[PDB]
Amino acid sequence: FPQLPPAPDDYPTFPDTSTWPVVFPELPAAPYGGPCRPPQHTSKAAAPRIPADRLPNHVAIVMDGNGRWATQRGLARTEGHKMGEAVVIDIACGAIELGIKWLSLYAFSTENWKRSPEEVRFLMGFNRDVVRRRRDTLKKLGVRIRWVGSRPRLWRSVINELAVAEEMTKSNDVITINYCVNYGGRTEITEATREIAREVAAGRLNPERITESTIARHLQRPDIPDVDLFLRTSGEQRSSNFMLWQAAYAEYIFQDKLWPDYDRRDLWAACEEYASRTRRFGSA
Amino acid sequence: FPQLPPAPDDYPTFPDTSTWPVVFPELPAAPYGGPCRPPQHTSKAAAPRIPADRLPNHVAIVMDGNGRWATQRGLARTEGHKMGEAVVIDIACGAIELGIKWLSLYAFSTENWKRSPEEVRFLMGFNRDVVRRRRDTLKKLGVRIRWVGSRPRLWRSVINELAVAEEMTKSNDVITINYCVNYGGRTEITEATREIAREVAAGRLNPERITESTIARHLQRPDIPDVDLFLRTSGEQRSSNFMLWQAAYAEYIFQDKLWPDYDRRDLWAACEEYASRTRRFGSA
Ligand SMILES: CC(C)=CCC/C(C)=C/COP(=O)(O)OP(=O)(O)O
Ligand SMILES: CC(C)=CCC/C(C)=C\COP(=O)(O)OP(=O)(O)O
Ligand SMILES: [Mg+2]
Ligand SMILES: [Mg+2]
Numbered sequence: 001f002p003q004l005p006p007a008p009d010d011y012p013t014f015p016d017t018s019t020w021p022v023v024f025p026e027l028p029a030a031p032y033g034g035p036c037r038p039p040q041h042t043s044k045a046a047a048p049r050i051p052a053d054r055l056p057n058h059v060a061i062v063m064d065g066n067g068r069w070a071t072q073r074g075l076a077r078t079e080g081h082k083m084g085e086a087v088v089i090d091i092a093c094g095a096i097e098l099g100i101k102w103l104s105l106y107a108f109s110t111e112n113w114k115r116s117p118e119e120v121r122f123l124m125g126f127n128r129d130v131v132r133r134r135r136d137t138l139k140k141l142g143v144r145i146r147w148v149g150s151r152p153r154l155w156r157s158v159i160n161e162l163a164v165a166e167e168m169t170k171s172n173d174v175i176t177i178n179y180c181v182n183y184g185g186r187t188e189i190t191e192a193t194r195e196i197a198r199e200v201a202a203g204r205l206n207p208e209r210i211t212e213s214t215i216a217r218h219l220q221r222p223d224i225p226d227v228d229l230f231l232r233t234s235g236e237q238r239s240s241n242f243m244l245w246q247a248a249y250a251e252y253i254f255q256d257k258l259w260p261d262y263d264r265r266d267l268w269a270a271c272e273e274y275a276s277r278t279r280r281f282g283s284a
Numbered sequence: 285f286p287q288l289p290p291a292p293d294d295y296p297t298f299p300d301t302s303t304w305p306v307v308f309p310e311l312p313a314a315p316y317g318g319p320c321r322p323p324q325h326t327s328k329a330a331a332p333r334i335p336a337d338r339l340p341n342h343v344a345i346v347m348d349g350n351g352r353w354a355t356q357r358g359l360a361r362t363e364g365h366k367m368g369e370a371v372v373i374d375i376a377c378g379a380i381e382l383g384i385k386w387l388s389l390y391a392f393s394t395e396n397w398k399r400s401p402e403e404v405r406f407l408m409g410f411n412r413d414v415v416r417r418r419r420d421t422l423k424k425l426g427v428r429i430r431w432v433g434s435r436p437r438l439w440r441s442v443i444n445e446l447a448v449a450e451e452m453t454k455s456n457d458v459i460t461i462n463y464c465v466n467y468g469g470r471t472e473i474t475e476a477t478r479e480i481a482r483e484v485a486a487g488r489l490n491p492e493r494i495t496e497s498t499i500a501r502h503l504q505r506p507d508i509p510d511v512d513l514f515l516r517t518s519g520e521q522r523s524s525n526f527m528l529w530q531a532a533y534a535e536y537i538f539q540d541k542l543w544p545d546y547d548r549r550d551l552w553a554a555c556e557e558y559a560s561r562t563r564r565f566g567s568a
Contacts, residue, residue, distance in 0.1 A: 186496045190496045193480060193494060194491055196480075210481055212470050240532075244532055248470055248525040250522065281398070282394075284398070
């Protein structure tokens with residue numbers, strides 16, 4: 001509707017935070033078919049009945065509040081980032097249940113190089129490890145995942161683990177996740193402009209025929225549709241250069257809770273809020 | 285502090301909406317030097333005291349709610365637009381009293397062509413008329429005003445009035461107002477890329493030396509600073525393609541009030557909220 005019908009009471013749940021990393025549970029097959037039904041949330045709550053025409057096609061999430069969450073508990077920054085991993089997969093599962101087809105996640109920004117070298121080194125190694133550790137699960141779920149971001153300075157290991165994940169999941173179609181690492185909206189537009197410039201220098205493009213579509217086709221990932229719902233947690237009301245081209249007409253929802261406390265029910269609440277919003281795209 | 289002191293109690297007030305267009309009051313002579321103090325608000329409220337370093341340098345406003353405002357009163361949508369003129373000038377006045385250096389106003393977007401022919405026709409002539417009617421006053425307040433927008437489809441008469449306003453006020457420095465008509469963020473970025481492409485074709489630019497700053501330098505108005513505070517009235521929570529490149533890192537404040545009900549005290553309220561907040565890591 002296009003939601004998955006409620007899960008059988010006994011269907012496996014997620015996340016069990018009794019251990020870290022959180023062990024993603026074994027799922028029954030349910031053939032003949034392809035993708036496994038994502039695990040139900042711990043609370044066993046069901047996705048709300050949102051009609052196709054009022055559901056966001058593409059949700060972009062700026063995950064925020066990890067450091068504050070850690071500090072509330074006298075913990076190292078790193079421990080809040082670690083708690084955020086389960087939340088990503090939880091939101092993936094909820095996204096699928098609700099029927100969201102595109103999901104962009106701001107895993108690491110071009111501005112995040114301004115953090116301490118210790119934290120940046122953790123975040124790089126952490127993203128590398130998360131993709132390696134979760135990509136098999138994501139594939140089973142019918143998730144198509146791939147890297148979106150800028151090449152310079154990004155660890156080759158992180159690009160390489162995502163390329164592997166991209167190849168493994170290239171024919172999946174339940175949901176697409178743009179895993180944005182070393183991503184910058186201005187930077188992505190700039191890279192598109194560089195490509196365009198090269199074609200002009202090569203005599204292959206008339207400057208006068210450059211249109212908005214020219215820019216869109218030359219973005220790293222030209223198939224990414226416009227952002228309908230732009231979410232950011234921790235109550236910070238800033239887009240921070242995320243999905244800059246794509247989100248020009250996005251609806252913003254700013255939720256107060258810190259990312260490690262976030263779960264799929266909060267995503268669902270944001271989508272209900274989106275459902276009530278009226279979008280005009282400049283029309284009367 | 286960069287605020288103007290509270291105005292003399294007997295200093296002219298603005299706006300009186302008992303006439304349309306509203307009458308801009310005669311102001312006492314400057315002995316001199318140049319720029320005259322703006323009329324104070326009808327309420328005689330004074331701008332809040334905010335250190336120059338904690339103000340937003342650049343405030344962008346999406347003026348919204350004119351149509352709903354008219355509809356509440358059983359009036360044609362264009363009657364709401366008419367009321368917006370006074371609010372623009374009142375906010376200009378209030379921005380000067382607060383010490384704001386940069387103000388961008390979204391007067392008509394590249395997507396507003398989707399509206400009815402009668403509303404578009406009105407908005408074009410209305411913007412033309414407002415600039416002609418208010419140009420001399422803005423000049424005497426020390427406002428530097430100029431057009432920001434895309435040329436195709438925009439009435440030449442609107443461009444022409446703003447050209448005269450730009451020339452008359454090019455040496456002013458109290459506040460800069462970007463008067464954005466037929467403005468579209470994606471379209472402005474595209475125009476810059478076309479500019480870059482032309483330079484590349486002429487050999488005056490190396491495509492491998494193109495950076496984010498190359499794009500910035502090729503925007504229509506390259507001197508526009510980053511938007512610090514992005515405001516939108518009417519309860520809508522979206523940027524709608526306004527100051528797209530420039531507002532990458534903006535803080536958003538959404539105010540529920542309809543534009544014709546807005547006044548300079550509301551601008552002050554948002555700026556004080558912006559200013560008083562602790563500027564956390566990852567915010568300039
Ligand atoms: C002062 C000036 C130049 C105003 C023009 C602003 C323009 C974009 C219309 C905003 O109201 P609206 O028409 O979008 O109102 P509503 O959303 O209620 O229909
Ligand atoms: C892989 C993971 C978990 C990514 C999370 C996103 C990351 C860039 C930091 C988000 O929180 P924060 O560090 O900015 O929190 P705070 O603002 O509270 O310090
Ligand atoms: Mg943060
Ligand atoms: Mg509107």
